[PDB]
C-alpha cells in the first residue's frame, strides 16, 4: 500500500499502490515495504519486480534511480524492457506504437509536409 | 402602385431582379442601333435607371417603399449595372446560403447587410449604439471562426468566450416566427416593433440572458418571450 | 436517401485540401474524407449504362449507411456493378419491392428496409474485396 | 493585366491559400501532440527538481562540491546549446534564436571567454557553418516526438567537455513557449545548481545507498540531460506554434491578394468588353 | 558545343524555383545552380563588342567542360575578356585552327582538342 510511480523520461508507466518492490540497487537487491525508511539509490541493468497481491510483474530496467519516501516510491528508471503485462508475446501497445507516432508524426508526415513544401515552392515561382 | 400612393396609402413595390430590367434596357438600346456604353450597356443607363426608382419616393400624400432583388453580373459590383443600382439604394439585405443551411428562415447576413438610415440623427442614439455593438460582436465571432475551427474552444481566452457565446445566441435570436408560415411550421407569427427590438437586443448585450443556453432563442420574438420560454 | 449523400459530399468538398494530409488528421475528419472518396467513386459511371431508380436508391442507401467503409476506394465501382448484378439475378424481389413503394412518404419504414439490408449483408458475405 | 494573365495569378495564389491553410491545420495538430509530450515529460523533470533541492542542500562543502556542480572560478571557455527547427517557414522564430545566440556570443567574447557551439536542428547547424563557428557536435533530423536517447549524442559530449575542463560553463538557447502566438527565445544555465529554490529541502536525510558522492556524480549527468530534453521538447512545441502563426498570416495575405487580384481582374474584364463593344460599333459604321 | 549549353541553361531555369527558396539542397543541386549562374554570367555581353565564331566556340568549350567551375561568378565576365585577350595575343594559332575547321562533322577532334585545353590550362595557371 505505497504510492509507487515508475516514471520514465518519456512517459509515466505506473502510478498505482503496491505491496512490495524487488528493487535491484547497485550495492545490492533491496525490497521495499509500505513504510520503508527514507532512501535514494542507483539502479543497474537488471530486472525490477513488483508484488501486487501475489502477482509478480518483472519490468526489466537497464538503469535509473529510485527515491523511497515513507509514503511514496518513485523510480526514475531511464528505460524499461520486459513486462509481464506485454513483454514480447501478447505485447500490443508497443506493436505499431511507432507508426501511431509516425504516420501522423514521422513516417509519411515527413513526406506529407515535404509535399506541402514542394507544391507550394513550385507554384511560388509560377506566380512571379 | 402610384394610384394607391395618391390615396395616402403606404405601398411596398417588389421588383424581382432589377438587373433583368437593366439588361432589357441594354437589349432595347442595341436593337435601336444606339452606341454601346461601358460593358456594352445602353448609353442611357443613368437616365433609364432614373426614370425608374425616382417615382419610388416618400411624398407628402403617401410613400412607396421598394425592396428590389438585384443580380450582380459575375458578382461584379463595380459593373455599371449594379453600380447604377447602388447609386439609388438606401438599404442592402444579403441573404446567405450558409445561414439558411441551418434552420433560420430570416437568413439575413448581419455583416453584409447595411443601411443608410442607420445613423443616430434618425433612428436615435440607442438604436445606432445597439446595432453597432451587435455588428462588433458578430465581427469578432466571424474573426474567431477560424481560431475555433483550428485550435478549438479551449485555447480561446476569457472575456472573448463570453462574446462568442453571446454572438451565437444573438445569431440564433435573429430567427423570428412568420405570420405567413404559421401553417407550415405550426408556430404563430410575431410582429416585433423596432423599439422593442432595440431594447431587447440591448438587454441581451448588457448581460441578461447569459445563463440561458443557445436554445430558447430560436424562432422567438422579444426578450421577454425568451425569458418566459426559459422559465417554462 | 440522397440528403445524407449531398451533405457528406459537401463536407468532403469543404475538406478537399486535406486529402493528401490524411495521415495527420482527426479520426472524424479522416472518416469524412474516406466517406467522401467512396461517394465520389460511386458517382463515377460508364457510358450508355443508365441505372433504373431502384438500383440507384439501393446503392445510395448502401453507401450512406456505413456499409461500404470496408471496401477500398478503387473497388467501389466494381462493388456497385456486382451488387446490381446480384440484385438483378439473385434478388429480383427486393428490386421489385423498392420500385413498388418508391412513392411512400416514409420510404424506409416498409419491410423493404429489412429486405434490402438482408440483400446487402448476403452480398457482402458472399463477396470479398 | 490582360484579363487572362490575372486569371492565372488568381489560380496560383488560390492554390497557395489552399496549401498554406492545410499547413496551418496540421501545425495545430502537431502542436497539440507537442504540448502533450511536454506535459508528459513534466513529472519526470519535476521529480529531480526537488531531488536536486534535497540533495544539493545536504552537499554544501566546497571541497565535496566538485565534478559537474563545481562553480569554477576564472571562467575561460564557454559552450552553448542551440535548438532550431529542422525545417523553415516557422517565421521569425529561427531568426530570433540565432539573433539571441549570435548576440550572446558577443558578450562572452567581449569578456574574453572563447565560445563553442552545439546545434540541434539543421537551421542552427547551417547558420553557424556559414558564419564560421563550426559546431563541435550537432544533432539533426529529430522527429516531432524525439526520445531522450536522441539527444545523448550531444549532451554526453557537452558534459564530457565540462568534466575534462574544456568547457568552464554550459548554456542552452531554446524557443520558450509563452503562448500559442508568442515564442520568445530563452537562455538557460546548464551548470548543476544548488537546491532549486526550496523543494522538501527540510525534514530530509535520504540514506544514499551507493554513497552520497556516488549518487550526486550519477544524477547530475541525468539531470542536465533532462533539462536539454525539456528544452528540446518545448522548442518543438514552439516551432509548430510559430509555423501555425506564420501560415495563418500567409493564408490571410494570400486571401487578401486574391481579393486584390480579383478586384483588378474585374477591371480588366470590363475594359476588355468596352474595347470589343467599341471596335464592333466602329466597324458597324 | 551549344547543345550542352542549352540543356544546362534549361535545367538551371527549371531548378531556379528550388534555388530561390531551398537552402538544404544537396551538393549536386548547389553545383548545378552554380554552373547555371556561370553560363548566365558568360552570356552577359557588353555593347559594341561582338565576338567572332571562333571566340564564342572557345569560350563555350571552356565553360561547358568544367574549366570554369573554380572561377567565382562575379569575375566570369572579366575572365572571359582576359581569356580572349590571351587567345588574341598569346595564341592566335588556336583561334585560326578553330575557325579553319569549324565545319567538320565532329568538331572536337583531338587536334583541335589539344592546343585549346592547353591554352585554357596555361591561362588558368598564369592568372588566379
mmCIF file of N, CA and C in Angstrom, chain B residues 66 74 89 113 117 137 162 166 176 186 196 208 224 232:
data_model
loop_
_atom_site.group_PDB
_atom_site.id
_atom_site.type_symbol
_atom_site.label_atom_id
_atom_site.label_comp_id
_atom_site.label_asym_id
_atom_site.label_seq_id
_atom_site.Cartn_x
_atom_site.Cartn_y
_atom_site.Cartn_z
ATOM 1 N N UNK B 66 -39.697 50.407 -51.787
ATOM 2 C CA UNK B 66 -39.440 49.271 -52.659
ATOM 3 C C UNK B 66 -38.310 48.412 -52.115
ATOM 4 N N UNK B 74 -21.717 38.354 -62.789
ATOM 5 C CA UNK B 74 -20.414 37.735 -62.447
ATOM 6 C C UNK B 74 -19.963 38.224 -61.067
ATOM 7 N N UNK B 89 -29.867 53.354 -53.942
ATOM 8 C CA UNK B 89 -30.258 52.432 -52.889
ATOM 9 C C UNK B 89 -30.077 53.059 -51.514
ATOM 10 N N UNK B 113 -25.230 43.132 -44.610
ATOM 11 C CA UNK B 113 -26.390 43.998 -44.755
ATOM 12 C C UNK B 113 -26.170 45.313 -44.019
ATOM 13 N N UNK B 117 -29.995 54.733 -43.379
ATOM 14 C CA UNK B 117 -30.760 55.385 -42.323
ATOM 15 C C UNK B 117 -30.276 55.003 -40.932
ATOM 16 N N UNK B 137 -19.762 42.571 -32.084
ATOM 17 C CA UNK B 137 -19.652 41.232 -31.511
ATOM 18 C C UNK B 137 -19.730 40.172 -32.605
ATOM 19 N N UNK B 162 -17.114 34.562 -23.730
ATOM 20 C CA UNK B 162 -18.414 35.169 -23.474
ATOM 21 C C UNK B 162 -18.945 35.869 -24.716
ATOM 22 N N UNK B 166 -22.312 34.886 -26.711
ATOM 23 C CA UNK B 166 -23.328 35.905 -26.948
ATOM 24 C C UNK B 166 -23.611 36.059 -28.434
ATOM 25 N N UNK B 176 -37.156 34.572 -36.367
ATOM 26 C CA UNK B 176 -38.398 35.184 -35.965
ATOM 27 C C UNK B 176 -39.548 34.435 -36.622
ATOM 28 N N UNK B 186 -46.284 25.518 -37.871
ATOM 29 C CA UNK B 186 -47.070 25.355 -36.660
ATOM 30 C C UNK B 186 -46.646 26.265 -35.531
ATOM 31 N N UNK B 196 -39.022 47.832 -29.480
ATOM 32 C CA UNK B 196 -38.940 46.599 -28.709
ATOM 33 C C UNK B 196 -37.722 45.784 -29.113
ATOM 34 N N UNK B 208 -28.037 40.266 -19.523
ATOM 35 C CA UNK B 208 -29.213 39.461 -19.226
ATOM 36 C C UNK B 208 -29.323 38.301 -20.208
ATOM 37 N N UNK B 224 -38.503 39.302 -23.542
ATOM 38 C CA UNK B 224 -39.414 38.801 -22.520
ATOM 39 C C UNK B 224 -39.989 37.449 -22.921
ATOM 40 N N UNK B 232 -40.559 28.440 -18.433
ATOM 41 C CA UNK B 232 -41.412 27.279 -18.649
ATOM 42 C C UNK B 232 -40.608 26.105 -19.200
#
